[PDB]
Design a protein around this ligand. Structure first.
Ligand code: HG
Length: 209
């Protein structure tokens, strides 16, 4: 299928005015350590004034915080979700299926990913590296995509509709009942990993390194 629309709308959500583009990789790498991340820590890493870090995070309405206002979750999170993202010995979580395929190349780490099929509840797992997916169980694993909505809570508009499934036909059966979701598409997990790769290389071209 055509995946350019998904790649395009994904990266315009982060490339938005005061978007997470430049902050994303360092924040993901910090969250990957399994501890809450302060804005002063992020400021020190980015060499940004506190004002700019706060302004970027302000627009990211889905960001998860703790009692101290420290960052607990942005795509990658310390709060339990249905997507388990095990990197090193730490048990972390992601907001959706696609995130788990995207994050490893950005962190520069290999992750053990696991979840359950959204249509049936059957367990699913795979290993995601910076350049490859492996140990895909079951083999015919599929992923749900929707077109991201620009000024909408990313979690409710995108993340909650992006699942793993036991198989393509299983996901196709599920999708036929959810035809009110804009740009809903069923791809294999390998097609979804390629989507993330296209996102990542396009993201890195605009990161002002
Ligand atoms: Hg997501």
């Amino acid at each position: 299928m055509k995946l350019a629309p998904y790649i395009l709308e994904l990266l315009t959500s982060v490339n938005r005015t005061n978007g997470t583009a430049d902050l994303l990789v360092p924040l993901l790498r910090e969250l990957a350590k399994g501890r809450p991340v302060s804005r002063t820590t992020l400021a020190g890493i980015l060499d940004w004034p506190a004002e700019r870090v706060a302004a970027v995070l302000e627009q990211a309405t889905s960001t998860e915080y703790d009692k101290d206002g420290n960052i607990i979750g942005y795509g990658l999170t310390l709060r339990e979700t249905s997507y388990v993202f095990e990197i090193d010995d730490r048990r972390l979580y992601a907001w959706c299926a696609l995130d788990t395929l995207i994050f490893p190349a950005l962190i520069g780490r290999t992750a053990r990913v696991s979840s359950h099929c959204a249509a049936t509840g059957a367990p699913v797992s795979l290993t995601v590296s910076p350049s490859e997916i492996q140990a895909v169980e079951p083999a015919g694993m599929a992923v749900s995509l929707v077109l991201p909505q620009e000024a909408a809570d990313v979690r409710q508009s995108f993340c909650c509709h992006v699942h793993f499934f036991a198989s393509v036909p299983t996901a196709e059966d599920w999708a036929s009942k959810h035809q009110g979701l804009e740009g809903l598409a069923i791809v294999s997990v390998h097609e979804a990993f390629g989507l993330g790769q296209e996102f990542n290389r396009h993201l890195l071209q605009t990161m002002s390194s």
